[PDB]
């Protein structure tokens with residue numbers, strides 16, 4: 001077989017460094033070889049060279065080759081999947097609206113590169129923040145691609161939730177089931193425990209039937225929400241290994257399918273006629289599985305109580321608002337020209 | 338199965354960060370769960386805490402639990418294997434004798450902790466520099482353990498050599514065979530291409546028969562020698578992912594055995610009656626394989642020409658010298 005071509009943007013950063021090695025080690029594509037397209041900006045090219053040197057010094061049997069570059073054509077040409085890690089960080093004094101705005105241009109341009117140069121079968125995982133909206137913008141501006149080509153990463157938050165709940169309950173993570181992260185990232189994200197069950201001593205119960213209401217519907221989202229800050233506080237830098245783990249997990253499931261009973265939160269273009277009353281037009285985190293053909297499906301059968309309904313409606317509203325900001329910013333720049 | 342207990346020293350550093358995650362992902366012990374013992378020093382507590390939070394945030398099914406601590410006893414208690422990454426760095430104005438001396442204390446103490454608290458079957462991989470001598474010192478001070486419990490990491494250098502020679506030949510790494518790293522780390526390391534072959538267009542030839550003499554016996558060793566430096570110059574930090582890769586490769590082979598035809602350079606206490614005329618009493622990188630019971634063996638059948646003989650003798654002499662420095666320093670401290 002021919003090697004799979006894999007793009008990583010912002011390749012010289014923390015996440016790119018780990019992600020490239022992990023993929024080159026064979027963890028993503030199994031026995032198949034990989035060819036890495038490694039994209040960054042000119043200031044970062046020395047760091048990027050250092051990365052390629054270490055890749056080389058691993059003598060990876062799965063690594064068919066690589067290109068390290070600042071050129072979009074070289075980075076996107078004939079790729080099979082992409083980890084869009086790079087984004088424009090928040091500048092001092094900026095609010096979220098400005099973050100959405102600055103990134104809208106990057107992701108418009110990236111959608112255009114994808115459509116022009118990537119394989120029609122390309123699987124694009126959006127990681128750089130604001131990821132749901134960056135994904136929507138990239139998709140909207142990729143004329144030869146389709147919704148099925150795009151998703152955004154919410155698995156980091158799901159993994160955080162699983163560990164938090166399992167620890168609280170005093171069980172292993174494998175003994176907790178059906179925790180879901182819905183909607184947008186950021187403040188409106190819905191960390192849903194209302195479906196969740198756990199097994200302890202051969203006894204299976206619902207999480208919300210055992211834990212205090214205060215914990216579930218207050219303390220829990222608080223700990224999840226301040227987790228990244230807490231890591232930065234102690235580390236001096238933001239997370240790197242844990243988003244990488246989640247990214248590989250998402251893509252591997254997307255490529256080859258999920259396991260029986262497995263439910264992974266994934267940001268996807270909202271399907272028309274989804275069973276949870278979400279309006280098409282944005283990228284929204286749903287409970288998902290993936291079939292052996294690599295197609296993502298929203299998992300049916302979960303229940304929406306009044307609390308969840310309100311939270312879903314709020315994060316839906318939030319996502320359409322972000323989209324509006326992004327499209328308006330692009331329209332204003334266009335008008336100015 | 339009960340969880341395998343895995344120690345990583347210097348856990349809060351760059352290598353420790355990646356190594357802990359890679360192991361927790363299941364890549365070392367397969368289906369068996371792991372329980373990480375993460376040791377570092379007092380000023381690194383916050384970075385260690387940060388590491389544990391990220392491990393937690395991966396929701397690894399292979400991670401049974403962890404201890405993250407500055408306490409020796411908690412870190413070494415009932416461990417099954419150890420990656421000894423931490424070491425005393427060279428301080429400005431110090432020479433190699435100083436580096437050997439400062440680390441001898443640390444590794445004497447580590448040998449004692451290992452003997453006192455680790456399982457008798459513990460597999461100890463020494464990574465922190467100077468690794469051959471650190472390994473020898475820890476072993477000598479591990480009363481209840483044996484030479485079989487100890488090895489040192491030379492696989493990063495072998496992997497570097499394979500990619501260098503493959504790139505020079507314009508072939509795939511898989512098409513190059515029998516490159517070996519012998520002896521000590523540092524200046525006297527022997528990057529041996531005299532056994533090595535490669536395949537291309539249906540022909541197998543010796544590397545030394547095809548590549549230029551100046552390349553093989555000068556340019557090549559210089560390239561391998563200034564590689565770490567060149568990465569530092571570009572990265573702003575020392576290598577991390579590549580030594581982690583080699584360390585997992587080494588330990589996984591040690592745990593389950595090597596594949597057919599596979600030859601891994603490994604630093605081991607010199608076996609009596611090894612076929613390459615090396616004296617017992619130091620830790621020396623040999624071409625090795627590992628049997629299905631996890632026992633390391635020196636590979637037989639390689640040839641020692643006059644060039645290799647001289648290089649082997651020089652690095653051997655170098656190792657016994659380093660050992661002497663370390664033991665003399667420890668002796669001074671006693672009296």
Ligand SMILES: NC(=O)C1=CN([C@@H]2O[C@H](COP(=O)(O)OP(=O)(O)OC[C@H]3O[C@@H](n4cnc5c(N)ncnc54)[C@H](O)[C@@H]3O)[C@@H](O)[C@H]2O)C=CC1
Pocket residue numbers: 009010011012013014015016039040041044085086087088089106126127128129130131153154156157238239240243
């Ligand atoms: N969705 C999720 O679950 C999470 C996402 N993230 C996102 O990942 C991003 C990267 O994180 P780190 O790797 O820690 O950051 P980093 O600052 O270490 O590296 C970012 C890299 O992107 C590069 N870059 C900037 N603009 C670029 C462009 N137009 N094209 C290509 N490369 C470009 C930089 O040169 C740098 O090498 C963050 O900015 C954040 O948005 C971070 C954590 C979790």
Ligand SMILES: NC(=O)C1=CN([C@@H]2O[C@H](COP(=O)(O)OP(=O)(O)OC[C@H]3O[C@@H](n4cnc5c(N)ncnc54)[C@H](O)[C@@H]3O)[C@@H](O)[C@H]2O)C=CC1
Pocket residue numbers: 346347348349350351352353376377378381422423424425426443463464465466467468490491493494575576577580
């Ligand atoms: N054998 C090989 O192939 C290679 C070995 N190395 C070795 O790896 C070592 C560390 O590399 P990184 O982790 O990237 O360095 P780093 O500087 O990022 O972190 C080293 C860690 O060791 C800790 N440490 C220092 N003294 C300690 C003690 N007595 N007990 C416990 N922890 C202690 C530090 O607090 C620090 O967290 C180097 O000292 C070097 O000797 C590096 C490259 C290749």
